[PDB]
């Protein structure tokens, strides 16, 4: 008896090790998938920072141009009011 | 023959255990990796918003440079017509 029973246990263990390896293999594959997603984080962060700095250079330049545009507009409006009078 | 099997069985038992600890370690890694990956859509939407803010800003700025030039020519042409 003892010999075939041990052999049965061993086969059971050996087959269970296959089922364990199968889950490991699937988990490792998902971890490869995950690592790629996670690797975009610094790129997305660098990309946001870049666009943020360019936005801010443009906003600063555009603010300085409303000031002089309103002044040109006022001088034009005032000059138009004189010509229409005389 | 028989003690060989007994010792093979014991190695298979330790291997079951060492495989399950690998599985458990892989599972808890996936847990902390899920957190990190759930930041991604927000970082994506952030990059998108700055891009849109930058493109609208650039466009508004190029328009304004053209309008400034335009007003300056009108101020000068209205002077010529003045005189």
């Amino acid at each position: 008896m003892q010999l075939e029973d041990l052999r049965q246990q061993l086969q059971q263990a050996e087959e269970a090790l296959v089922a364990k390896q199968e889950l490991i293999d699937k988990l490792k594959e998902e971890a490869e998938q995950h690592k790629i997603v996670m690797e975009t984080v610094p790129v997305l962060k660098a990309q946001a920072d870049i666009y943020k700095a360019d936005f801010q250079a443009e906003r600063h330049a555009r603010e300085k141009l409303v000031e002089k545009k309103e002044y040109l507009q006022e001088q034009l409006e005032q000059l138009q009011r004189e010509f229409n009078k005389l | 023959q028989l003690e060989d099997l007994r010792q093979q069985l014991q190695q298979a038992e330790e291997a079951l255990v060492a495989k399950q600890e690998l599985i458990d370690k892989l599972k808890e890694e996936a847990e902390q990796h899920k957190i990190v990956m759930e930041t991604v859509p927000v970082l994506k939407a952030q990059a998108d918003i700055y891009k849109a803010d930058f493109q609208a800003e650039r466009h508004a700025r190029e328009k304004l440079v053209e309008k400034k030039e335009y007003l300056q020519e009108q101020l000068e042409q209205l002077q010529r017509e003045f005189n």
Binding site: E14, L17, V18 | -
Partner: peptide, 29 residues
């Protein structure tokens, strides 16, 4: 049993081995 060649890394293992000595994969995987 006899020696067995791991089907993943090709290492020739001892008959008694349950996992591959090198890549650690089970004999029947």
């Amino acid at each position: 049993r006899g020696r067995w060649a791991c089907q993943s890394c090709t290492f020739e293992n001892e008959a008694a081995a349950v996992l591959c000595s090198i890549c650690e994969r089970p004999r029947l995987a």
